[PDB]
């Protein structure tokens, strides 16, 4: 009840009753808020409501102080002062951006731009408000009750009438009824249960609406620059393998936090694990939002770091299969690998946060609250994919607005840049270098002469809204017959429904662009499927074509991106 103002820290008994997070607002700032927004309910120990019996006046601008109580204009005593006067709301201890964050529905991109260009306390208010809004939106969706169980991987669902049906992709994880978390993929549907249970007919599934906790720590700690390496003890005998990053590892010890921009295959995991070999006494906590990103850091550590000093932290509510080679849940080991949402409350000499474009400001703040470190290293690439913003439907979110770290990398530049792509054939490196890296990404490999492009719009069908292009899959089928080496290719597309159709017709393993991020394959077959802003997104395009080590086949819909591909064009 007695707290600090979210805009100027000035201690106050006032909280806005109309804000979903009920932020503490000082006398001067609370006024500026209520007089310029639909928000008029003000809270204290006792709320600002007319005390006269059965009176429903709750608007602070229509209320007054009758000695030590509150009444409206109809019930106030003769000796009464308005609660709103002289730019203040009467309270104990006597913003255009705050108003927009407090009242927006988070469906426009301009809302996310503001949530990242505002002050640090407003980045936290925006992050809790958004996450709480995203949670109440899960309640709007309809329940799915099991109508029939066909086999061990297929079932038929009955949906709730009057309430919308949530998108059926791996992005939406339901909580089954607690018969474990489950996911669905498209009258025959495919059921993927985290726990193996003999699907009961009648058992219902409801979305994982979790409670949004308040944020205390900033998204980024205030930057500190040092004259020498602080609290970290380096080696002189540092393996030749990691010699390329020695100046960069030293920059890490001479700053509180550092940003590393690493385009695809430039050595991000190698840099992250090599930092442990450079400061061999340093206790390092490796974190990322996804289990896949944490597991990819575990695979690199398994090769260079002693296995007895590693531990993979697994939340007691084990969602998916992850890394099994380190001792599980030993928080005290020198090397701790854990997803952000499972981080224990501990300290470290270095905290490494990978896949930084997938972090939200909420995740950035949680890491600063659960981990107190001498150094923080943020690794990722603002030219790769961001975290999905389920509420955002109007506008495109630019990389400088993904999070605070991405904002820094796109404005003031990253502290460190890994400039040599060692994964991709030169045709792919030269294409993305020009597209998203301002020609600063260099190719280590030669041109493979296995990178093809085909301009073919096909026919766009839809499974609700997820798109399908059967003629583009028909072109791939015709190509596979003529190019049997491509039998081992991974099929990639911007749509789950396109992938479902290609899995049956081609038999190739499938991956969406978003689920392919961080992974690499010898051959990639990409079908653009549509000409939407989603399938044309340059960050998504960049991720899609940089998955390939040897060859890529792109069946394109957009002329712009087709013309930019520095690939050999094919006919049909
Ligand atoms: Zn204030
Ligand atoms: Zn408010
Ligand atoms: Zn009244």
Curated annotation (Swiss-Prot):
Interacts with nsp8 to form the replication-transcription complex (RTC): nsp12, nsp7, two subunits of nsp8, and up to two subunits of nsp13. Interacts with host TBK1; this interaction inhibits TBK1 phosphorylation and decreases by 75% IRF3 phosphorylation, which leads to reduced IFN-beta production. Changing residue 348 to V: In strain: Theta/P.3. It comes from Severe acute respiratory syndrome coronavirus 2. Zn(2+) 11 binds at residues 5, 8, 26, 29. Zn(2+) 12 binds at residues 16, 19, 33, 39. Residues 237-418 form the (+)RNA virus helicase ATP-binding domain. It is found in: Host endoplasmic reticulum-Golgi intermediate compartment. LRR repeats lie at residues 208-228. Changing residue 399 to S: In strain: Mu/B.1.621. A ribonucleoside 5'-triphosphate binds at residues 262-269. Plays a role in viral RNA synthesis. Multi-functional protein with a zinc-binding domain in N-terminus displaying RNA and DNA duplex-unwinding activities with 5' to 3' polarity. Activity of helicase is dependent on magnesium. Binds to host TBK1 and inhibits TBK1 phosphorylation; the interaction with TBK1 decreases IRF3 phosphorylation, which leads to reduced IFN-beta production. This is Helicase nsp13. Zn(2+) 13 binds at residues 50, 55, 72, 75.
């Amino acid at each position: 009840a007695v707290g600090a103002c979210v805009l100027c820290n000035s201690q106050t008994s006032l909280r806005c009753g109309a804000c979903i997070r009920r932020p503490f607002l000082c006398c001067k700032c609370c006024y500026d808020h209520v007089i310029s927004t639909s928000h008029k309910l003000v809270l204290s120990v006792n709320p600002y409501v007319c005390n006269a019996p059965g009176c429903d006046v709750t608007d602070v601008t229509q209320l007054y102080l009758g000695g030590m109580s509150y009444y409206c204009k109809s019930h106030k005593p003769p000796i009464s002062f308005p609660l709103c006067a002289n730019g203040q709301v009467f309270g104990l201890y006597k913003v255009t951006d705050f108003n927009a964050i407090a009242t927006c529905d988070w469906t426009n991109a301009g809302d996310y731009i503001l949530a990242n260009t505002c002050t640090e306390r407003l980045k936290l208010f925006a992050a809790e408000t958004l996450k709480a809004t995203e949670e109440t939106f899960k309640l709007s969706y309809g329940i799915a009750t099991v109508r029939e169980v066909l086999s061990d991987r297929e079932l038929h669902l009955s949906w709730e009438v009057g309430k919308p049906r949530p998108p059926l992709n791996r992005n939406y994880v339901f909580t089954g009824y607690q018969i474990g978390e489950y996911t669905f993929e498209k009258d025959a549907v495919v059921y993927r249960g985290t726990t193996t249970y003999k699907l009961n007919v009648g058992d219902y599934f409801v979305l994982t609406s979790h409670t949004v906790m308040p944020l205390s720590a900033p998204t980024l700690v205030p930057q500190e620059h040092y004259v020498r390496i602080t609290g970290l003890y380096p080696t002189l005998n540092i393996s030749d393998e990691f010699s390329s990053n020695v100046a960069n590892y030293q920059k890490v010890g001479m700053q509180k936090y550092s940003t590393l921009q690493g385009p695809p295959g430039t050595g991000k995991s190698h840099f992250a694990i090599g930092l442990a070999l450079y400061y061999p006494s340093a206790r390092i906590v490796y974190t990322a939002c996804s289990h896949a990103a944490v597991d990819a850091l575990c695979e690199k550590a398994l090769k260079y770091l002693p296995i007895d000093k590693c531990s993979r932290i697994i939340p007691a509510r084990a969602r998916v299969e992850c890394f099994d080679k380190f001792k599980v849940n030993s928080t005290l080991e020198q090397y701790v690998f854990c997803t952000v949402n499972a981080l224990p409350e501990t300290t470290a000499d270095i905290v490494v946060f990978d896949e930084i474009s997938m972090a939200t400001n909420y995740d950035l703040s949680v890491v600063n609250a659960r981990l107190r470190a001498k150094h923080y290293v943020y690794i990722g690439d603002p030219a790769q994919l961001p975290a999905p913003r389920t509420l955002l439907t109007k506008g495109t979110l630019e990389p400088e607005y993904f999070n605070s770290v991405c904002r820094l990398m796109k404005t003031i530049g990253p502290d460190m840049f890994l400039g040599t792509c060692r994964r991709c054939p030169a045709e792919i490196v030269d294409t993305v270098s020009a597209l998203v890296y301002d020609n600063k990404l260099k190719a280590h490999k030669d041109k493979s002469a296995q990178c093809f492009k085909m301009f073919y719009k096909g026919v766009i069908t839809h499974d609700v809204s997820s798109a399908i292009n059967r003629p583009q899959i028909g072109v791939v089928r015709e190509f596979l017959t003529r190019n049997p080496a491509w039998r081992k290719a991974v099929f990639i597309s911007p749509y789950n429904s396109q992938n479902a159709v290609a899995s049956k017709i081609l038999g190739l393993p499938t991956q969406t662009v978003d689920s392919s991020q961080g992974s690499e394959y010898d051959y990639v077959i990409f079908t653009q499927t549509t000409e939407t802003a989603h399938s044309c997104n340059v960050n998504r395009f960049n991720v899609a074509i940089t998955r390939a080590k040897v060859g890529i086949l792109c069946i394109m819909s957009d002329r712009d991106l087709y013309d930019k591909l520095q690939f050999t064009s094919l006919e049909i």
